C-alpha cells in the first residue's frame, strides 16, 4: 500500500549491496574537487567517497555532484567527515595539506602536514586494509614518505603524484614547439618534484627519433633548456593569474587511476621508494618511471642516467632525508 | 639547421589549418569552468575557446586546461577577452551574468544583465554567423529572450538551459526513493525555471508504469509533492553549504552539447519560444520537451497538460512579459 | 644473458596471474564468431575463451582474433576443445546446436541437441561453478530448459537469448515507419521465441505516447499488424539471401553481456523460468522483461497482459512442456 | 488521420537530409563484412554503404546489419549493386578481388583484378569526388597502383592496407615473447607486403630501449629472426586452419579509418607512392610509416634504413614495376 510496494516486486533470492571499485578522495578543495570530477567523468569507480573536515563544504560538494547523477555512470556518491565512509576503497587520493606561510621553512611546513596526516591516514588503512594510496599533497615526495610511514603499507601501495603532471607539461610545451600532439612527443622529468626536477634530455624523442642526435644535440646552450624552466615556472604563472591549480592536476590523477584500476601496467613518472637506486642510500621517495597495476607499483624502469643527472638525484635524496627530522615543531 | 627542420619534413601539398566542431564558453566563473571541463572530458569539440573580461583569470584558466593536453582529445584550447577568438563556433554557452543584490527587484536585475549582454552577444554572432546559443545565465527564461532579441538569430538557434537540470534533479530524487537509477525514472519539470516550475505528475513513470495510476494517484496530499519542493530547495541548500553551483550544471550542459553536436534528436526540457503554445500569446521563452539536432531546436513535444498546469504556465508567461519593459534602469 | 632478462627486471614482490571478468563462447560457427567479436570490440571481459569440437577451425579462429591484439583491449584470448580452458568464467554463451533436417520433428531436433548438450554443459559448470549461462541456440526456450536441467544451476543463472533480438527488430521496423531512432521507439515481443511470439501492441510508444490511444488503436485490421509478421519473416528472408544470421544476434548478446557484466539492472526480454506466471503451471522457459545484474536474472517485470495474450503464452507453455519428453530418440 | 501524423508534428523550418561522415565498403566477402562491422562497432561514420555484385548476399548482409540498429550508433545502413549508393563517401574500402589459381602467374592474377577494378573504381570517383580510397585487396601494393591509376586521384588520397596488419602481428609476437602488451612493443615491417617484407630490426624497442643494443644485437643468427617468418607464415597457418582471414584485417582497417576520420595524424605503415624514396625511380607503391589525416596521406616518416634493407626495398620496386605491363591478358 506503498507506491514502491505496488511497483517493485522481488525475486525470492538476493544479496547484500555492494561496491567493488570504490575510490575515496580526501579534501574538497580545488585539487580534490578536480580529482573527483575527472574520476567520475571517467567511469573508474562504482563508488566515490569524499572526505573532508569542513562539514558544510563537504555536504554541498557531495550534493552538487549527486544532482548530476543522470549524466554519469557512478552509482553511488558519498561524503563523510568520518573515515568509516571510505571503508572498502581500492584507491585513496589525498589532497589535504597546509600551504606554507610567511617565513615558513620547508621543515616547519612538512612538520605542519605531519600533524594533519596523523589524523588522516591511520584511519584510512583501518577502514581500507587493501587500498593503495595516491599522494597529491605538496611537497609530494616528503608527504609520500610520511603517508608511507604513517600507514604501515607495503611500499608498493604508496605512490606520490610526483613528477607526472610536470612531464605532462613538458610533453605539452614540446608539442607546441614541434607541431605534433603532446602524446606523440616523449620526454621525462624525474627526480624531486619542483625546482629540482631533472629533465632527461637524452630520452627526448618523436616517433623514436632522438632530439639529441639531431639538434647537433642540446642540454647546454641554445634555447631549448628553457623548456624545463617554464615547466616549473608556468606553474607559478597559473597561480599568479588564477589563484590556484586544479584542472591539469585532477586530469593527471584520473590518468593514474585508470592505469591502476584497469590493471594496465602503463609507465608513469610517479614518486616511489628509490632507496639503493642510483646510489641513494636512505628512505627517500622521488620520481622514476614505474609500471602500475591494481596493487600499485608493479615495477621500476631503470633509466641509464648520466652522473650529472644522478648527482642531482642524490642531492634531492639528502635534502629530503634531512627534513626527515620529523615529529614535532 | 633547426631541430624542427631537421626532424619534420613536408609533402608537396597541404591545406590551411582548421577547426570544425568549435565550441566557445563565455565566463570563467564556477559554471563556466564546470561547463568547459565537462565538454572537454566528453570529446564534443575539436576546439574550445574561453571568453571572459577578467584578463588574468582567463589566461590562468586557459593555462591550467592546456597543461592537461596529454590527458585529453581536444586539439586546440584558447581564451580571449576579444570576441574574434570565438570566430567559427558551432555552439556558444553563455554563463556571464550579475547575481542580484540587496534589495534588487527582478526587473532591475534583468536590466543589469541586459547592459552586459549588449556587449557580449552582438559580437558572438558577428564572429559566428552559424552558431547556436545556449543560455545558462539566470534568470534563464528572461536572459534567453534577451539573447534572442540581441542577436537576430532564428528562434531555433537560441536555447535556454531552462528546466533540464531541475528534471535531472527530480529524476535523481525519484530514483533514491524508488531504488532504480535516475536514468530509468522519467518525470518532467517544465515551465518557468525556478520556484514556478511545473512538475508533470501524470508523466511520472518507471519502465512505462505510470506512478499516478498505482499510488491510487498523487498530486494532492500524501508526501510525494515534497519531491518538487526540494528540487528547487536543495538547490539553495547547496549554495548555503558550498557557496555556489557548478558540477551538476556543467554536466547538464555537456549533456545538451552532445545531443546538439552529434545531431541526436534527443528530447530535452530546455527553454524555448513558447508563443501560441498553451494559449500563451506573447514573446516569452519557457521550458518544453524539445528534440535537439545540430541546428538547435528541431521540434517541440506537445504535452497534454491539465488546465491546472497550463494555467500556471500562463502565469509565468505574463510575469515574464511584464519584465520585458527593458532598455534601461 | 637473454634479451628478456637484459630488458625486464623485477620487484621483489608479485602475484600469480589472473583473470576476473572472463567470458567463454561455445561454438565457432557464424553466431559464435559474431558473439565473440562484439564482446571483444566492447571491452566486457579481461579474458575470452573459445570452445568448439572442430580443432582446426578453432585454432584458426583463435589466431585470426589474436593477431588483432594491438587493436583491442582484451588481454588474453584462448581456445580449447577441452573445457578446462573455460575454467573461471563469469559468463558462458552457448551457440552450439544441430540445425533441423529434412523431415525432422521439433521433438527429434531437441532430442538431437539434448545429446550434444550432455557433453557441453556439465563440463562448464564443473570448471565454472560461479558462471551464469546464456543460451543462444535454437530452439532457445527448450534449449534453455535443457541447459538449466543439465547443469544444476539456480534458475536465475540460466538465461535464454529468447525474444531480445526480435524486439530489437520490432523497434527497428517501428523506427523506419516512424522516422525516429530504434532506441526511441519502445515495444515488446515476448512469449515463445519464433512464430509464436506475442507483440504487446498496448505497450508500443514513442516519448511515452501510446500508439494504441492515437491510431484510434490497432491490433485488428489496418496494416500495422504486418510489423510483427516480417519481424519473424524478414529473419527467414536473411537466411534465404545470405545463408545464415550472425551480426544482429552477436550484437544482441553483447548488449546482454554488458548489462550482466556491468551490473546494470537493465530490462531485457530474455527467456526465463515462467512457472506460475500467467497461469503457467510447469517448468517452461519463455520471454519476459527481466532486470539483469551480474548474478543473472535479478527480477521480472510483471506485464499486465490481456487474456488474448496470456492465452497465447499458455499455448506455448503446453506445447513446450510436451516436447519435454526428452532422454532419447 | 495517420498514426505518424497524429504523433509527429513539425517546426515551420527544416533542412534536406544529410550524411557527413559517410563510408562505403566494396565486397561483402569475409574481409568486407569484417571491415564493415568493425567500422560500425567503432562509430566512425554516420552512414555505411555496402557495395557488391552479388545481389542476394548483399541484401542479406545489409539486413543482418540493419536488424542490430538498436545496438549501434550508425544512423543509416545501405547496400547497392549500383555505385550511386556510395555517392558522398569520405572513405572507400575496396575488398573485391580474384584469389589466384592453379597455375596462375602473379602477372595473370593482377591482370584479372585489373578488369574487375575497371568497373569498380571509376564509378566510385564519379559518385565520390572527394573520397580517399583504402585498398585492402591482395596483392595490395599492385592493386593500390591500379586503383591510383584507374581513378585519377591525387596520390595522397590513395592508400593501401599494405604492411599495417603484418606490423600488428609482429608487435603481437614480440609481446608474447616479451610479456608486455602488443601496444607497448614497437617494431616495423615495411616494404612490399608479403614474403618480401622488411623487418626493421634496429627500430625494435620497448619503452624506448633498443632491443638491438641489448641482445648484443640481432638480425643474423640466434633465434629471433624467426619472428618475421611466422608473421608471414602464421598468416597461411590461419587459412590452412580456418579457410580464410577476416577479424584481424577488419580490425586493422577500422584502426586506419579512425585515424583518417578523426584527423589524428597517427603514424601507419601503409602502402604509398614511394617514387624517389630510397633510390626507387618509378611508379611503385610500397609500405612506409605515413602520418594520416582526413585527406589521406599527410606525410612520410623518413626511415634511415641500411643498404641491406633499402636494397631489398629496391628489389620489390623493380619486381612490381615489371608486372606493370598491364592492360590485357
mmCIF file with all atom_site columns, C-alpha atoms in Angstrom, chain D residues 207-266:
data_model
loop_
_atom_site.group_PDB
_atom_site.id
_atom_site.type_symbol
_atom_site.label_atom_id
_atom_site.label_alt_id
_atom_site.label_comp_id
_atom_site.label_asym_id
_atom_site.label_entity_id
_atom_site.label_seq_id
_atom_site.pdbx_PDB_ins_code
_atom_site.Cartn_x
_atom_site.Cartn_y
_atom_site.Cartn_z
_atom_site.occupancy
_atom_site.B_iso_or_equiv
_atom_site.pdbx_formal_charge
_atom_site.auth_seq_id
_atom_site.auth_comp_id
_atom_site.auth_asym_id
_atom_site.auth_atom_id
_atom_site.pdbx_PDB_model_num
ATOM 1  C CA . UNK D 1 207 ? 59.778 1.837   -23.502 1.00 0.00 ? 207 UNK D CA 1
ATOM 2  C CA . UNK D 1 208 ? 62.460 3.373   -25.779 1.00 0.00 ? 208 UNK D CA 1
ATOM 3  C CA . UNK D 1 209 ? 65.057 0.673   -25.219 1.00 0.00 ? 209 UNK D CA 1
ATOM 4  C CA . UNK D 1 210 ? 66.502 -0.673  -28.442 1.00 0.00 ? 210 UNK D CA 1
ATOM 5  C CA . UNK D 1 211 ? 66.415 -4.461  -28.471 1.00 0.00 ? 211 UNK D CA 1
ATOM 6  C CA . UNK D 1 212 ? 69.397 -4.378  -30.829 1.00 0.00 ? 212 UNK D CA 1
ATOM 7  C CA . UNK D 1 213 ? 71.787 -2.723  -28.322 1.00 0.00 ? 213 UNK D CA 1
ATOM 8  C CA . UNK D 1 214 ? 70.862 -5.128  -25.547 1.00 0.00 ? 214 UNK D CA 1
ATOM 9  C CA . UNK D 1 215 ? 70.779 -8.577  -27.212 1.00 0.00 ? 215 UNK D CA 1
ATOM 10 C CA . UNK D 1 216 ? 74.426 -7.958  -28.054 1.00 0.00 ? 216 UNK D CA 1
ATOM 11 C CA . UNK D 1 217 ? 72.197 -7.302  -31.066 1.00 0.00 ? 217 UNK D CA 1
ATOM 12 C CA . UNK D 1 218 ? 70.352 -9.460  -33.539 1.00 0.00 ? 218 UNK D CA 1
ATOM 13 C CA . UNK D 1 219 ? 69.471 -9.763  -37.207 1.00 0.00 ? 219 UNK D CA 1
ATOM 14 C CA . UNK D 1 220 ? 71.833 -12.664 -38.081 1.00 0.00 ? 220 UNK D CA 1
ATOM 15 C CA . UNK D 1 221 ? 71.646 -15.887 -36.125 1.00 0.00 ? 221 UNK D CA 1
ATOM 16 C CA . UNK D 1 222 ? 70.286 -16.778 -32.660 1.00 0.00 ? 222 UNK D CA 1
ATOM 17 C CA . UNK D 1 223 ? 66.503 -17.360 -32.920 1.00 0.00 ? 223 UNK D CA 1
ATOM 18 C CA . UNK D 1 224 ? 64.658 -14.016 -33.106 1.00 0.00 ? 224 UNK D CA 1
ATOM 19 C CA . UNK D 1 225 ? 64.703 -13.665 -36.902 1.00 0.00 ? 225 UNK D CA 1
ATOM 20 C CA . UNK D 1 226 ? 62.044 -16.385 -36.560 1.00 0.00 ? 226 UNK D CA 1
ATOM 21 C CA . UNK D 1 227 ? 59.726 -13.618 -35.504 1.00 0.00 ? 227 UNK D CA 1
ATOM 22 C CA . UNK D 1 228 ? 59.403 -12.347 -39.046 1.00 0.00 ? 228 UNK D CA 1
ATOM 23 C CA . UNK D 1 229 ? 58.960 -15.712 -40.691 1.00 0.00 ? 229 UNK D CA 1
ATOM 24 C CA . UNK D 1 230 ? 55.787 -16.732 -38.847 1.00 0.00 ? 230 UNK D CA 1
ATOM 25 C CA . UNK D 1 231 ? 54.431 -13.200 -39.176 1.00 0.00 ? 231 UNK D CA 1
ATOM 26 C CA . UNK D 1 232 ? 54.106 -14.078 -42.885 1.00 0.00 ? 232 UNK D CA 1
ATOM 27 C CA . UNK D 1 233 ? 53.663 -17.831 -42.219 1.00 0.00 ? 233 UNK D CA 1
ATOM 28 C CA . UNK D 1 234 ? 51.202 -17.878 -39.320 1.00 0.00 ? 234 UNK D CA 1
ATOM 29 C CA . UNK D 1 235 ? 49.064 -15.993 -41.874 1.00 0.00 ? 235 UNK D CA 1
ATOM 30 C CA . UNK D 1 236 ? 48.957 -19.083 -44.103 1.00 0.00 ? 236 UNK D CA 1
ATOM 31 C CA . UNK D 1 237 ? 48.547 -21.092 -40.943 1.00 0.00 ? 237 UNK D CA 1
ATOM 32 C CA . UNK D 1 238 ? 45.209 -19.346 -40.349 1.00 0.00 ? 238 UNK D CA 1
ATOM 33 C CA . UNK D 1 239 ? 43.911 -20.047 -43.838 1.00 0.00 ? 239 UNK D CA 1
ATOM 34 C CA . UNK D 1 240 ? 45.005 -23.728 -43.604 1.00 0.00 ? 240 UNK D CA 1
ATOM 35 C CA . UNK D 1 241 ? 43.060 -23.919 -40.343 1.00 0.00 ? 241 UNK D CA 1
ATOM 36 C CA . UNK D 1 242 ? 40.059 -21.701 -40.929 1.00 0.00 ? 242 UNK D CA 1
ATOM 37 C CA . UNK D 1 243 ? 39.866 -21.342 -44.705 1.00 0.00 ? 243 UNK D CA 1
ATOM 38 C CA . UNK D 1 244 ? 40.249 -17.534 -44.696 1.00 0.00 ? 244 UNK D CA 1
ATOM 39 C CA . UNK D 1 245 ? 41.129 -14.243 -42.852 1.00 0.00 ? 245 UNK D CA 1
ATOM 40 C CA . UNK D 1 246 ? 38.805 -11.526 -41.602 1.00 0.00 ? 246 UNK D CA 1
ATOM 41 C CA . UNK D 1 247 ? 38.796 -10.444 -37.987 1.00 0.00 ? 247 UNK D CA 1
ATOM 42 C CA . UNK D 1 248 ? 42.441 -9.210  -37.762 1.00 0.00 ? 248 UNK D CA 1
ATOM 43 C CA . UNK D 1 249 ? 42.249 -7.426  -41.081 1.00 0.00 ? 249 UNK D CA 1
ATOM 44 C CA . UNK D 1 250 ? 38.862 -5.795  -40.460 1.00 0.00 ? 250 UNK D CA 1
ATOM 45 C CA . UNK D 1 251 ? 40.213 -4.593  -37.087 1.00 0.00 ? 251 UNK D CA 1
ATOM 46 C CA . UNK D 1 252 ? 43.320 -3.288  -38.833 1.00 0.00 ? 252 UNK D CA 1
ATOM 47 C CA . UNK D 1 253 ? 41.237 -1.161  -41.211 1.00 0.00 ? 253 UNK D CA 1
ATOM 48 C CA . UNK D 1 254 ? 38.999 0.340   -38.543 1.00 0.00 ? 254 UNK D CA 1
ATOM 49 C CA . UNK D 1 255 ? 42.275 1.392   -36.965 1.00 0.00 ? 255 UNK D CA 1
ATOM 50 C CA . UNK D 1 256 ? 43.122 3.194   -40.238 1.00 0.00 ? 256 UNK D CA 1
ATOM 51 C CA . UNK D 1 257 ? 39.625 4.654   -40.607 1.00 0.00 ? 257 UNK D CA 1
ATOM 52 C CA . UNK D 1 258 ? 39.647 6.115   -37.094 1.00 0.00 ? 258 UNK D CA 1
ATOM 53 C CA . UNK D 1 259 ? 42.911 7.930   -37.720 1.00 0.00 ? 259 UNK D CA 1
ATOM 54 C CA . UNK D 1 260 ? 41.636 9.214   -41.083 1.00 0.00 ? 260 UNK D CA 1
ATOM 55 C CA . UNK D 1 261 ? 38.139 10.131  -39.912 1.00 0.00 ? 261 UNK D CA 1
ATOM 56 C CA . UNK D 1 262 ? 39.242 11.814  -36.651 1.00 0.00 ? 262 UNK D CA 1
ATOM 57 C CA . UNK D 1 263 ? 42.100 13.616  -38.390 1.00 0.00 ? 263 UNK D CA 1
ATOM 58 C CA . UNK D 1 264 ? 44.570 12.098  -35.977 1.00 0.00 ? 264 UNK D CA 1
ATOM 59 C CA . UNK D 1 265 ? 47.942 12.320  -37.795 1.00 0.00 ? 265 UNK D CA 1
ATOM 60 C CA . UNK D 1 266 ? 48.870 8.916   -36.371 1.00 0.00 ? 266 UNK D CA 1
#
